[PDB]
Amino acid sequence: CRVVRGDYLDC
């Protein structure tokens, strides 16, 4: 998983 700034998946 990378990050959530337009980068997270479902974790």
Cα distance between residue 6 and residue 11, in whole Å: 13
Q: Are 2 and 8 in contact (CB under 8 A)?
A: yes
Q: Are 1 and 8 in contact (CB under 8 A)?
A: yes
Q: Are 11 and 1 in contact (CB under 8 A)?
A: yes
**Cα 6 from chain centroid (whole Å):** 7
Rounded to a whole number of angstroms, the CA Rg of the chain reads: 5
CB contact set of 8 (below 8 Å; sequence gap of 6+): 1, 2
